[PDB]
Amino acid sequence: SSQIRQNYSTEVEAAVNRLVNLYLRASYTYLSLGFYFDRDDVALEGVCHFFRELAEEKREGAERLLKMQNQRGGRALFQDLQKPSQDEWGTTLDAMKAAIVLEKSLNQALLDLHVLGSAQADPHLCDFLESHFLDEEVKLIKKMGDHLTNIQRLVGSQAGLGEYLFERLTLKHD
Amino acid sequence: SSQIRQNYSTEVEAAVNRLVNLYLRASYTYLSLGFYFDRDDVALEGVCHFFRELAEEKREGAERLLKMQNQRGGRALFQDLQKPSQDEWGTTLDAMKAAIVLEKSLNQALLDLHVLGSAQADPHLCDFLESHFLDEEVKLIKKMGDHLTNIQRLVGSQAGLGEYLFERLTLKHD
Amino acid sequence: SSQIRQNYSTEVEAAVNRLVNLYLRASYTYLSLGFYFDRDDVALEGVCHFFRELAEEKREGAERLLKMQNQRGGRALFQDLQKPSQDEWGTTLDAMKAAIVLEKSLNQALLDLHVLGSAQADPHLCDFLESHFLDEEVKLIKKMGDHLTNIQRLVGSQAGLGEYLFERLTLKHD
Amino acid sequence: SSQIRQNYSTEVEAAVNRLVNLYLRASYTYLSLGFYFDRDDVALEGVCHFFRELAEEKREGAERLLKMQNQRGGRALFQDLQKPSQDEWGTTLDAMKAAIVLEKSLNQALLDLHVLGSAQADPHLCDFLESHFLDEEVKLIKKMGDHLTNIQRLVGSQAGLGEYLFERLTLKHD
Amino acid sequence: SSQIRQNYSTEVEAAVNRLVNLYLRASYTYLSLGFYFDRDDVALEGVCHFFRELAEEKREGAERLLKMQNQRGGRALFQDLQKPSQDEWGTTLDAMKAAIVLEKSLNQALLDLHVLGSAQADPHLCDFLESHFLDEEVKLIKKMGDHLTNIQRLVGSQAGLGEYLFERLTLKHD
Amino acid sequence: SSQIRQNYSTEVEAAVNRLVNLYLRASYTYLSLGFYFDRDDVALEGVCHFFRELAEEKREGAERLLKMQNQRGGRALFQDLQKPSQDEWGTTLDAMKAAIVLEKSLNQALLDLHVLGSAQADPHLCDFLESHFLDEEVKLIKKMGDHLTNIQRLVGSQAGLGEYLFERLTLKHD
Ligand SMILES: [Cl-]
Ligand SMILES: [Cl-]
Ligand SMILES: [Cl-]
Ligand SMILES: [Cl-]
Ligand SMILES: [Cl-]
Ligand SMILES: [Cl-]
């Protein structure tokens, strides 16, 4: 079949298609998180913007994987995309906890694919993940952890005040 | 009589004059709200500015209706303007609640005039309201709802602190 | 009560609130005059613009009085606003005569408040009126008088011609 | 037949073709009006320019309808274009009266097509007319009405003087 | 419940959520179409770019609907997203035929929601669709129809040549 | 009658009015040709643009004749405008053949009027045609002939391919 494919296992090809589904799932989760914080009865603009930006980031990660799949001569295969785990996301703290859980699941999927690529002696795949995904994920998880700590310190006995202040003074808004 | 009037019912003409009175009433309400928050014993500059801007907006809406009345060949008729419902407006929360009530009453008057225009097969009137009023009102009511949520979250057990913080960190001031 | 109020009589405070009502009444009168001259069966654009500008000027005068009321520690109190004296304003000459009458009534109210301020030994009030109102009114009444003379000279036996020419060659239009 | 046509009735398609004929008729009427006022024995340059501009406007309206007909998958069908109603157009007043009559006939045709579109549940057609035709027509009829009033006021007992003055001081010329 | 919701039916709210699912489905379909034409054994860059741009457009339409849902005080509810109808999309002609079918299904959903909004006397919804969706869809379907005609004329007896030429000389590429 | 007319025969005056009708007929023919090539089932943008430009050119020629008629003191007289000869224009080749036929008929009318002007010893008319019409027509007919030759060479056994290529590589498009 493929005129270009070289050193690209069927196992890696399938795992890349699965990883695309995971990233598009994550993008959809962030879309939902974003619009929840835009509700008039929630109304935390900086929180909305934070998650909308992540929805775009995860979309872009999926696109990069798809580009790479074609560069290697694999075939993109798309599956249904499950809806996010919740319809309502609670407080900023609840939301940021759910986001860290989601990011750790993406990071583990990256690490798992690196293990497979390594076992298949596929250095192009391994360096692709190293160069465009692993550090991006470490940096984002650090950021989220920083945010969680600041959110947690602001709860005190005045949760509403703290949630407002975090949105106003840490998160980016107009 | 009119050399230009075409497809413009007497019912619509009268309802437009009434709507002008409603908008000028609303402008006057906002003038009063604005100067209340400028009192030395109230002194919330961002709140003052918010309502003064709305007084100008409602004035402008009345002017647009009057322009349209002449464009269609109707006759502007002005009636007395009642004073606002209160002389003192309480807290920012009280004020923002009164403002949302006022805006919903203007929105219902717009919707009622759209019903009449539709029934009179007056598409110029219907598109005039759609193009220059309905979405402006939806956007403003959303904004006010967002504000109400943030005000409410800041009350906690420290109402003065929360009222200060909202004025400082959400509303526009010098 | 007031933490800032000093040398500010209740009599002056009330008279300022009344003067605000007079200026907003005058603004409303000019709004009506303006839209009358915008009628397709009247259609004197320069006349329309002249009165619309005065509606804005009178609004601004009311706002300045309200600002001053708060600066002195008085309390703004708003009353109903009566509608203008006429629904239709006749010729440019009729309109300019009504405007001069209106301006002389505002000027007399200014002068009356100056008398009260003087009697109450309130030099801040007296200089406020001198600096921001008295000369503005003298200048406007002179302008209107100039206009009345030119309108009157153009009536001749050809009233329509003269009314057109005055609008075209004295008043500001596009 | 058509690969793109959706929700586009034969009735609307035919009425659009008729409306194109009406607009091109109107354009031709304005061409004739324009060149009449360019005659050396008429010689009212501002009047000539006014009508030549309207000939272009009506041409453009016909072109927009034709574009829309193709966008919806209808078929443009052209019919003969009748010549204007007069060869000589009388005074500026006669001409402006004929123009208002013409514009009211175009406005009624627009309104009639809106009724048909509404009855056919064709919201694209209805919004097309609302967005690009109805307000343009209301604005033009208001302008013409304004002009008629000023022309009429200038007739007096000196018709030639008034006709000159209107052309010089209201209408655009070099 | 909602502090802002006014004249916004539960029926419209649900239909908007369904329409979001339809637009995100369409975006996913275009993502798949785009990456198919990027395959080394397909390799039609202009075709790839055409569909990738549409994936972004449909995403943006879904985002606009979600924004509007919150502006009106409805609640966004997300459902699973089905995968596209095909894994391989055939020729440019096959692909463009599938795209027109997809667009006509989105257009019918828009028209159906307009019918519901009209029946619910919801003019804000109706004008929202008119202003941001209906004409965009008519323009896109016209474009696709134009493309289909040119593709079809190029098939002749030399399908590969024609498919190359269309991609090179009609579609945008680097 | 005319204060300016000199050396301008009634025969020339009438022939100029007829020539205006011919040019406006030709403009209408080109309008129809243009919109035919804009049909979604025809879709040859460069061909559409070619004929739309000619519709404008022929309109302008009619306007120049009308200007000249007034400059000489003749009287413009407009007649009904017949619709174009066809509703559907076939292939680019069919269309370009019809256009050359049309242009040769305009050229012969120009030449015929030059004969009349010459016989009437009307050098202003003769030079007017020489300076603004005769060479423009020769240049356009040469262009059309060039186009016909290239269209004809591209028919071969692959008519659709050739028609596409001509539109793409000879005619001006976006
Ligand atoms: Cl699920
Ligand atoms: Cl009252
Ligand atoms: Cl009264
Ligand atoms: Cl006729
Ligand atoms: Cl499925
Ligand atoms: Cl015929």
Please give the structure tokens belonging to residue D65: 């309808």
Instruction: Tell how far CA E76 is from the center of its chain.
Output: 20
Write phi, then psi, for D81 (nearest 5 degrees).
-110, 115
CA distance D79 to E149: 28
CA distance F160 to A103: 54
> From the CA of B40, how many Å to the nearest CA of chain C?
7
> From the CA of F48, how many Å to the nearest CA of chain E?
13
Total count of residues recorded for chain B: 174
Write phi, then psi, for D111 (nearest 5 degrees).
-65, -40
Is residue C63 within 8 Å of C133, Cβ to Cβ? Answer: no
Cβ-Cβ contacts under 8 Å, D38 against chain F: 67, 70
Torsion of CA D140, D144, D146, D152, to 10 degrees: 180
Burial readout C148-158 (b: 16 or more C-beta within 10 A, e: otherwise): beebeebeeeb
A81 SS3 class: strand
Please give the structure tokens belonging to residue A106: 């993406």
B130 annotated as a binding-site residue: no
Task: List CB contacts of F173: < 8 A, sequence separation 6 or more.
Answer: F45, F46, F49, F167
Burial class (CB in 10 A: 0-12, 13-18, 19+), C119: exposed
Is residue A155 within 8 Å of A92, Cβ to Cβ? Answer: no
Scanning the structure block, which residue is given the tokens 């030059």?
Answer: F114
Burial class (CB in 10 A: 0-12, 13-18, 19+), C107: middle
CA of A83: how far to CAs of A33, A51, D131, E82, in Å?
A: 12, 16, 39, 10
Is residue C81 within 8 Å of C17, Cβ to Cβ? Answer: no
CA distance A128 to C114: 83
- Is there contact between C and B if contact means ≥3 C-beta pairs under 8 Å? yes
Please give the structure tokens belonging to residue F32: 């129809």
Cα A61 to middle of ligand 1, angstroms: 21
Scanning the structure block, which residue is given the tokens 């976006």?
Answer: F174
3-state helix, strand, coil in chain C (%, to 5): 75, 0, 25
* CA angle, A151 then A156 then A159, to 5°: 70
Interface mutation target, options F81, F82, F85, chain D, most CBs of D under 10 Å: F81
Cβ-Cβ contacts under 8 Å, A45 against chain B: 146
Binding residues of C for Fe cation: 53, 56-57, 60, 63
* CA angle, D141 then D145 then D147, to 5°: 115
CA distance F38 to E149: 11
Is residue F75 within 8 Å of F69, Cβ to Cβ? Answer: yes
E163 annotated as a binding-site residue: no
CA distance B40 to C72: 9
Cβ-Cβ contacts under 8 Å, B72 against chain D: 138
Cβ-Cβ contacts under 8 Å, B127 against chain D: 127, 130-131, 134-135
Nearest to A38 by CA among A48, A29, A28, A24: A48
End-to-end CA distance of chain C: 53
3-state helix, strand, coil in chain F (%, to 5): 75, 0, 25
CA distance C4 to B80: 35
D57 annotated as a binding-site residue: yes
- Is there contact between B and E if contact means ≥3 C-beta pairs under 8 Å? yes
> 3-class secondary structure for E126-167?
HHHHHHHHHHHHHHHHHHHHHHHHHHHHHHCCCHHHHHHHHH
CA of E160: how far to CAs of B81, E43, E166, E172, E173, in Å?
A: 76, 12, 10, 19, 18
CA distance A126 to A120: 10
CA of C53: how far to CAs of B121, C56, C132, E20, F115, in Å?
A: 36, 5, 18, 49, 65
Task: List CB contacts of F157: < 8 A, sequence separation 6 or more.
Answer: E157
E172 SS3 class: coil
Cβ-Cβ contacts under 8 Å, D134 against chain E: none
Please give the structure tokens belonging to residue F52: 């739309």
Cβ-Cβ contacts under 8 Å, C48 against chain B: none
CB contact under 8 A, E40 and A3: yes
Looking at residue C52, its amino acid is: R
Torsion of CA D112, D118, D124, D129, to 10 degrees: 30
Is residue F58 within 8 Å of F23, Cβ to Cβ? Answer: yes
> Rounded to the nearest 10 degrees, what angle do helices E135-155 and E159-169 cross at?
140
Closest partner residue to F78 (CB to CB) among D32, D66, D79 is D32
CA distance A90 to F99: 71
Is residue B36 within 8 Å of B55, Cβ to Cβ? Answer: no
Nearest to D88 by CA among D152, D37, D151: D37
Q: Which domains can be identified in chain A, with CATH numbers?
A: 10-170 (1.20.1260.10)
Is residue B42 within 8 Å of B36, Cβ to Cβ? Answer: yes
CA distance E100 to F98: 34
CB contact under 8 A, E128 and B139: no
Task: List CB contacts of A95: < 8 A, sequence separation 6 or more.
Answer: A33, A36, A37, A47, A51, A89
D53 annotated as a binding-site residue: yes
> From the CA of F40, how many Å to the nearest CA of chain D?
7
For residue E149, give the chain F residue with the closest CA. F41
CA distance B103 to B54: 11
Please give the structure tokens belonging to residue F38: 């804009």
CA distance E29 to E103: 11
For residue D8, give the chain E residue with the closest CA. E138
Is residue F5 within 8 Å of F58, Cβ to Cβ? Answer: no
| Category of C156 on φ-ψ map: left (φ > 0), alpha (ψ -120 to 50) or beta | left
CB contact under 8 A, A160 and B154: yes
CA distance B108 to F113: 69
CA distance D88 to B46: 66
DSSP per residue over B141-174, as a string?
A: HHHHHHHHHHHHHHHTT-HHHHHHHHHHHTS---
CB contact under 8 A, D40 and F4: yes
E49 SS3 class: helix
Residue E81 is classified by DSSP as B
CA distance E156 to F165: 13
Residue C133 is classified by DSSP as I
Residue F133 is classified by DSSP as I
CA distance F37 to F50: 10
B56 SS3 class: helix
For this PDB entry, the determination method is X-ray
Burial class (CB in 10 A: 0-12, 13-18, 19+), A6: exposed
CB contact under 8 A, A79 and E78: no
Cα F17 to middle of ligand 2, angstroms: 71
Binding residues of A for Fe cation: 53, 56-57, 60, 63
Q: Which residues surround ligand 2, an ion (CB under 5 A)?
A: B 82
Ligand nearest to the CA of E79: 1
For residue D73, give the chain E residue with the closest CA. E142
* CA angle, B26 then B32 then B35, to 5°: 140
- Is there contact between E and A if contact means ≥3 C-beta pairs under 8 Å? yes
CB contact under 8 A, C35 and B79: no
Nearest to A69 by CA among E168, E34, E55, E85: E34
Nearest to E107 by CA among D139, B90, C65, D124: D124
Torsion of CA C44, C49, C50, C53, to 10 degrees: 160
> Rounded to the nearest 10 degrees, what angle do helices D159-169 and C159-169 cross at?
20
Cα B79 to middle of ligand 3, angstroms: 8
DSSP per residue over chain D, as a string?
A: --SS--S--HHHHHHHHHHHHHHHHHHHHHHHHHHHHTSTTT--HHHHHHHHHHHHHHHHHHHHHHHHHHHHT-------BPPPS-S---SHHHHHHHHHHHHHHHHHHHHHHHHHHHHTT-HHHHHHHIIIIIHHHHHHHHHHHHHHHHHHHHHTT-HHHHHHHHHHHTS---
CA distance E109 to E24: 13
Q: Which residues surround ligand 4, an ion (CB under 5 A)?
A: D 82
Instruction: Tell how far CA C49 is from the center of its chain.
Output: 15
Ligand nearest to the CA of C25: 3
CA distance E39 to E62: 28
CA distance C9 to D23: 70
